[model samples]
Target: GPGAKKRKMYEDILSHVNILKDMDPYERCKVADCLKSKSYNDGEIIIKEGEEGDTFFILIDGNAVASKDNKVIKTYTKGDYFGELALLKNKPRAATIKAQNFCQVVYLDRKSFKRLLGPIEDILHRNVENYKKVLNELGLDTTCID
Candidate 1:
């Protein structure tokens, strides 16, 4: 009973994530089934730049910031996702993501990400390219994601 309700909740939230918004209902449900939730306290480091990252994360609640070279690159809130570039490219994390407040996130490990999200790889690559361009333009190191 509890698991079923949790599955439903994740499915509902996954429907609203920008990257997964285009997935069909069945695909979203599949992704929900693969997700695992984790909580982080304020100022926790969610992802560290230059470190190998094997998980993709979707922020289900609260706020976080992405930084590079000690500079804030972006802010993430509910429905925002990150760590895809590392998982997709098999590279180090491009930016450090830290919680600004308490955070609740749903994550997919590398194996799950590859299996459940393979159908959307093209879209994810496009997004990664966009991220590379933006980060380069901002004078941040592009090696981690490339």
Candidate 2:
């Protein structure tokens, strides 16, 4: 089925990401089962800034850019993920992501993130610092993140 194909691709992607590297193939399978794939066209908003979000996205195909305060803050390709801070900290969406050309992303919800990837929460916590380093350049303030 097409959904199964999507699951397999996301499973592979989950295993490949630095964030999910410690997860074995079986673990990846469960998380991939929860992923939902969606596509966006050129200049479409994938993640809206300042809105609350329950889903974080992992780019599977094509490219996109993220902006905060209407300024470009980040770009993404395969395996790049975002909108996680909102899930972790119960915060608002920090930035807006717009598709470039056409893009495919496999996303997981907050419930799945907490349940499927909960054991590896620290991995994402540590990754949070890396994002902060990037956000530092843009002056993402205490209000944007803790």
Candidate 3:
């Protein structure tokens, strides 16, 4: 019952994301079945730079800032997503994300990512230029080196 309740919560959460909006009900339900919700307090670190990560997150509420060595690189509000790079590249987190306020996120870990979203893997591969754009915008090296 608890799992089903959480499933419903995640399904409701996923409905708000545009990327997943077009998924069929059964597919959306399948994604919901694999998601987990997490909350972070103000000033808390959600992702640490350079740590291997298997989960990708979609922000559902509040704001957060991404940083490297105390330098702010990006900011996120509701509807933003991150950690997708890790799922795609099998690498560590690209930067640290600190909550600017109370925040809620729905995440799908690597296993689920591969299972539910794997069909769209090419989308990520095709977006390498976009990823490089972000890195370039952040004044970070676009090289594959760590």
In model 3, where do residues sit more than 4 Å from their true spots?
Answer: 144-146
- TM-score for all models, in order of appearance: 0.93, 0.88, 0.84
Preferred candidate (lDDT higher): 2 or 3: 2
After superposing candidate 1, which stretches have Cα over 4 Å from the reference?
Answer: none
Q: What residue runs in model 2 are displaced by over 4 Å at the alpha carbon?
A: 1-5
Best by lDDT: 1
- 1 or 2, greater by lDDT: 1
lDDT by residue for model 3 (1-146), tens: 22988888778877787656657778888888777778999999889988989888889999999876566767999988777776676777778999999999988778888788765566656555566666777678665323
Q: Please give, for residues 10-94, the per-residue lDDT of candidate 1 as tens digits.
A: 9889888888877899998889887899999999999998899999999999999998888888899999999988887777887
- For model 1 the TM-score comes to 0.93
Ten-residue stretch with the least lDDT total in model 1: 137-146
Against the true structure, candidate 2 reaches a TM-score of: 0.88
